[PDB]
Design a protein around this nucleic acid. Structure first.
Length: 78
RNA sequence: UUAUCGGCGAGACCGGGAUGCACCUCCCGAAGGGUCU
């Protein structure tokens, strides 16, 4: 709840171009909720694929670890 | 944004004492002079 609780306020939004599309897949590891049949491994769950994630039938999905950490230097490498 | 919603709050004196002072001469030398009812 960013709206109600003001959790996870952010600023200084910086966008940088990437070289490889790392939105859905990452060497076969899903980086976001994807259907089970997509062949991507990770953690099983139930959720709608498309937002908003509180409406729509909750179908089986594979999603990454809820808390993923990466070094900022590695993230800025691109 | 995996839901929907939620002020953390209320009260307090921090203050009470102290001399910083005690000793030193800054002086030593020179002509500013000469030209035009």
């Amino acid at each position: 709840d960013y709206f109600s609780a003001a959790n996870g306020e952010f600023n200084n939004v910086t966008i940088l171009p990437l070289d490889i599309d790392t939105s859905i897949s990452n060497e076969g590891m899903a980086l976001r909720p994807v259907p089970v049949n997509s062949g991507l491994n990770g953690i099983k769950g139930v959720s709608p694929l498309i937002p908003p994630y509180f409406v729509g039938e909750k179908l089986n999905i594979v999603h990454p670890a809820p808390v993923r950490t990466q070094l900022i230097s590695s993230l800025l490498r691109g």
